[PDB]
Nucleic acid binder design. Structure first.
Ligand SMILES: [Cl-]
Ligand SMILES: [Mg+2]
Ligand SMILES: [Mg+2]
Ligand SMILES: [Mg+2]
Ligand SMILES: [Mg+2]
Ligand code: NA
Ligand code: NA
Ligand code: NA
Ligand code: NA
Ligand SMILES: [Sr+2]
Ligand SMILES: [Sr+2]
Ligand SMILES: [Sr+2]
Ligand SMILES: [Sr+2]
Ligand SMILES: [Sr+2]
Ligand SMILES: [Sr+2]
Ligand SMILES: [Sr+2]
Ligand SMILES: [Sr+2]
Ligand SMILES: [Sr+2]
Ligand SMILES: [Sr+2]
Ligand SMILES: [Sr+2]
Ligand SMILES: [Sr+2]
Ligand SMILES: [Sr+2]
Ligand SMILES: [Sr+2]
Ligand SMILES: [Sr+2]
Ligand SMILES: [Sr+2]
Ligand SMILES: [Sr+2]
Ligand SMILES: [Sr+2]
Ligand SMILES: [Sr+2]
Ligand SMILES: [Sr+2]
Ligand SMILES: [Sr+2]
Ligand SMILES: [Sr+2]
Ligand SMILES: [Sr+2]
Ligand SMILES: [Sr+2]
Lengths: 46, 81, 56, 82, 143
RNA sequence: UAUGCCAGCUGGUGGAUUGCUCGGCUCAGGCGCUGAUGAAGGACGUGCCAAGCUGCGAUAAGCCAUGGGGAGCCGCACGGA
RNA sequence: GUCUGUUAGAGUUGGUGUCCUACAAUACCCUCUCGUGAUCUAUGUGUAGGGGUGAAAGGCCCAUCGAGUCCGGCAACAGC
RNA sequence: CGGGUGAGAACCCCGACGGCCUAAUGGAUAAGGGUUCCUCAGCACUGCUGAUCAGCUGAGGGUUAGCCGGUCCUAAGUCA
RNA sequence: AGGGAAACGUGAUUCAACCUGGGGCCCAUGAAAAGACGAGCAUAGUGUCCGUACCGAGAACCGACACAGGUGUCCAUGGCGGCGAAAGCCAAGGCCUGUCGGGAGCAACCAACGUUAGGGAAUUCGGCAAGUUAGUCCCGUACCUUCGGAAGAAGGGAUGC
RNA sequence: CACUGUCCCAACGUUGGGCCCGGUGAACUGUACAUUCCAGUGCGGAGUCUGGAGACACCCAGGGGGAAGCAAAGACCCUA
């Protein structure tokens, strides 16, 4: 498929959004990314 | 009002284009055209832009590969910043 | 040819997409109409009283 | 150091399309026995390998002469075609 | 050690099918340390990395058969698998023959051997399939 | 006496129970319009490190003034710098 | 709207074979039928629910059809 | 069958021998997917067994066009 | 220029692509528009914006799965073979991932197969299942018929090196 | 007509399972009790009641006689 500039920004965001919760946030909160996604098992919008 | 250049794009590949081809790489605002990137650069570092290549990255921002004239030395420019 | 699995393999058409107006993936790019907010069909926002119980 | 003639007649008990592998087992098990060592201690020089697979997997010579040597501090044999 | 990456790079530098690059069994360590295409070429030069030759089917046996058949052998009833019209296209064969007859008649006319109307008479006869071949035509011409 | 039955003991598994309440549910009083000066909503950005939430909008968890407040502070969030 | 044909491709007579907590909520194998035409096929496009579409089997309209699906009427009514 | 790496090797890698695929098990692409691509470091999770491997985990990096598409034109048809 | 370790060919045949003609068919007639040519040459300047990774499948798509299903295009001219884009075998290229292994002459039983004396459909609702026949050439070919067909009727002979 | 393991009547063999071992590792089903058998009885179709008979426990493999086996609040029939 072909992606428009906007569709790319969105996919781009969904990629960055798919990260680990910073090691330090777990300390600061004295002990999970509930939105963690997988390209194969999940399905993004559009 | 948005500024054109956001920050230099320093990565192994960027370093080469700099060493071997007198090209500098920047992260630019995705609303900037090659022409607006060229002018922006010449004014920020006082150098002459021969060519510009842009790419809309998967990071959400635009990357620009600015080649300087043989009159300027990319490495030198990059070094002061 | 079965209507089940065999016929699912033919599905690679894109219809519903992210809607510029409400953000839901309901903008039918062939109809150019958001089945969610009704963008492209109604200037008003798509509402319906049946979307909730009658006394609520 | 000794030259032994190994019969591979018992490889016929295994399905025909894979007699080669079985043959290689039989060889190892024969040396390990006749030289009083562990099968894990038996090293088959690739030359033996090629002899058994020479006509593909479904076959194998019915016998094979191998030259074996025994030694070291763990007690193991090294063998090869002839 | 895992040399998969290098195998891929070497297949591109030696420019051959990946399945033809050979890595010296006693130099994995060095090949393992190869990171860049330059490292690979260097190793190619040393000979630690090489390309096996591609194969080409032998046509020797085919050639022998090709001769026997050109000589008219090995084409008996027991060797034919296709219908006669398939072994030789009839319309094609006719194009072959009739052109050879018309040419013949053309040379015999500019050569003065045949008058215009004699040529015409034979030409139309030819076009009507009166002659089995050029030789058959000449036989006829000799009254 | 093996395999085993019934009950208990020690330890698990499990999360009932008791205790606790940052959330609900209901009632009462007050108050009550927004938008082309582009709303409501949404998208995408925005932090030294930042994924979520909240906030904010290229001046981007903020800028200015007046008053209050006060030795502490840099949101949820007890980390490091 | 010819013939043979596992050319591509379309289909499916029989085995009532294999499978039947399957590889698969319609699959596998062999046999079989079509294969220049009322042919097959991709994408785009149109027709919408008492309405479509149907060389007509009450066939098909997203595993759903003698009246799709979703939510609402709704906590339908029943002597069972 | 040897060997490499490794705390650990039937299934990660090298070589030899032995095989499998030929309208495809090879080459290039549409749709669709969306980072699955490359590198390093890993093996609690995912993987019909194992794993040092990986489409898995962690961290970085990667897509450069006057002349390839889009963009322009109009098709069935669609909307304002 | 480039490429090659090196040589760094010349002729021929058959000829995909591509080019250009001739014929036949229709109760069927096989798009439109932008654009281009028509309409020279120099030199210079400008040519922005968007897509560009990878998979494209017995593990990257849809089917809840790393699903034996489904899923469009082109590579249709690689060699032998033969009528052949058929079988079978083999290159170029790819792979050992249609991803658990180790043992027992490895029993009974099951799946999918091979071979079975004499008899030869007696089996069965039914020859179901299996088998028989088979490519090509020559000879030869009945009833019936809408004169097209039936017809590869049937039947017989040949086949290598 | 031809041919043949369809049959008389079965045999031997091949490949993959089956069996043993490492590893991985479900589901169906479960009121309880339960080593049964022959009779009888009982809502007239009993492992469980009565009378006898038999019965040392546990495990492996098997083909499925019974549990009116398991699966789906019978679709036939009547009733509303
Ligand atoms: Cl012509
Ligand atoms: Mg671009
Ligand atoms: Mg003719
Ligand atoms: Mg698989
Ligand atoms: Mg009978
Ligand atoms: Na997906
Ligand atoms: Na108010
Ligand atoms: Na494996
Ligand atoms: Na050929
Ligand atoms: Sr999927
Ligand atoms: Sr990145
Ligand atoms: Sr049909
Ligand atoms: Sr489709
Ligand atoms: Sr509208
Ligand atoms: Sr309304
Ligand atoms: Sr036809
Ligand atoms: Sr049937
Ligand atoms: Sr069969
Ligand atoms: Sr079935
Ligand atoms: Sr046909
Ligand atoms: Sr309701
Ligand atoms: Sr481990
Ligand atoms: Sr990879
Ligand atoms: Sr020609
Ligand atoms: Sr590409
Ligand atoms: Sr497939
Ligand atoms: Sr090959
Ligand atoms: Sr595996
Ligand atoms: Sr025999
Ligand atoms: Sr009969
Ligand atoms: Sr009979
Ligand atoms: Sr004959
Ligand atoms: Sr059983």
């Amino acid at each position: 498929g072909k992606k428009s500039k906007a569709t790319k920004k969105r996919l781009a965001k969904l990629d960055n959004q798919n990260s680990r919760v910073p090691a330090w946030v777990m300390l600061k909160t004295d002990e999970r990314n509930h939105k963690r996604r997988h390209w194969r098992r999940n399905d993004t919008d559009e | 009002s948005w500024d054109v250049i956001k920050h230099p794009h320093v990565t192994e590949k960027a370093m080469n284009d700099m060493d071997f081809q007198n090209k500098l790489q920047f992260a630019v605002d995705d609303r900037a055209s090659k022409g607006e990137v060229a002018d922006a650069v010449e004014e920020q570092y006082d150098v002459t832009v021969e060519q510009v290549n842009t790419q809309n990255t998967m990071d959400g921002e635009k990357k620009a590969v600015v080649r300087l004239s043989e009159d300027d030395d990319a490495q030198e420019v990059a070094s002061r910043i | 040819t079965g209507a089940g699995t065999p016929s699912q393999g033919k599905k690679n058409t894109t219809t519903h997409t992210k809607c510029r107006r409400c953000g839901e993936k309901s903008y039918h790019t062939k109809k150019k109409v958001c089945s969610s907010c009704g963008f492209g069909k109604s200037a008003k926002r798509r509402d319906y009283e049946w979307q909730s119980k009658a006394g609520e | 150091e000794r030259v032994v003639t190994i019969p591979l007649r018992d490889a016929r008990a295994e399905p025909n399309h894979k007699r080669a592998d079985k043959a290689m087992i039989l060889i190892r098990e024969h040396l390990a026995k006749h030289f009083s060592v562990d099968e894990d201690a038996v090293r088959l020089d690739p030359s033996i390998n090629e002899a058994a697979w020479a006509r593909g997997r479904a076959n194998t010579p019915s016998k094979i002469r191998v030259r074996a040597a025994r030694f070291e501090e763990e007690g193991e044999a090294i063998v090869e075609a002839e | 050690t895992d040399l998969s990456a290098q195998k891929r790079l070497a297949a591109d530098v030696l420019d051959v099918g990946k399945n033809r690059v050979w890595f010296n069994p006693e130099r994995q360590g060095d090949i393992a340390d190869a990171i860049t295409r330059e490292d690979v070429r260097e190793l190619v030069d040393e000979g630690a990395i090489q390309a096996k030759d591609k194969k080409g089917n032998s046509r020797g046996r085919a050639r022998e058969r090709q001769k026997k058949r050109a000589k008219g052998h090995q084409k008996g009833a027991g060797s034919r698998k296709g219908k006669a019209g398939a072994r030789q296209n009839s319309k094609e064969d006719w194009e072959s023959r009739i052109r050879a007859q018309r040419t013949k008649l053309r040379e015999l006319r500019d050569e003065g051997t045949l008058s215009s109307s004699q040529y015409r008479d034979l030409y139309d006869k030819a076009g009507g399939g009166e002659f089995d071949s050029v030789a058959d035509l000449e036989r006829y011409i000799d009254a």
